[PDB]
Amino acid sequence: HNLLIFCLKDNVSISEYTEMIDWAYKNIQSETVVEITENQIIEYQNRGLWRLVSEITDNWLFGPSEGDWLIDKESILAVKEKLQNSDFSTEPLVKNIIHVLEYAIKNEKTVIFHF
Numbered sequence: 001h002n003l004l005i006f007c008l009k010d011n012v013s014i015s016e017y018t019e020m021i022d023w024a025y026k027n028i029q030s031e032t033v034v035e036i037t038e039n040q041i042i043e044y045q046n047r048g049l050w051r052l053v054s055e056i057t058d059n060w061l062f063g064p065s066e067g068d069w070l071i072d073k074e075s076i077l078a079v080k081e082k083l084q085n086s087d088f089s090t091e092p093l094v095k096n097i098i099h100v101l102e103y104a105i106k107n108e109k110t111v112i113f114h115f
């Protein structure tokens with residue numbers, strides 16, 4: 001089951017957590033869902049992406065692992081800034097994560113990391 005970084009869409013309110021995760025795995029087509037494969041995890045670990053995230057969240061110091069993480073507006077903006085200012089800020093995965101963050105800001109959503 002790939003790592004997800006996501007928020008719900010604008011007109012989706014599902015409050016039960018397990019059900020939100022189920023929604024994300026069922027809506028991988030969504031612009032609000034980033035699916036991240038093992039090979040992406042490794043590629044970006046070795047380039048310092050997760051370390052950049054960890055500067056704000058203090059998690060994933062050694063990359064992602066099984067678990068659930070919830071990112072609030074303050075941290076969403078802070079991570080978004082880190083990524084926009086980074087050396088891979090134009091690479092698709094980073095753009096895709098940025099986009100989830102922007103959407104969550106715009107639509108007042110919590111961002112979930114799930115693996």
Ligand SMILES: [Mg+2]
Nearest residue numbers: 010011107108
């Ligand atoms: Mg709305």
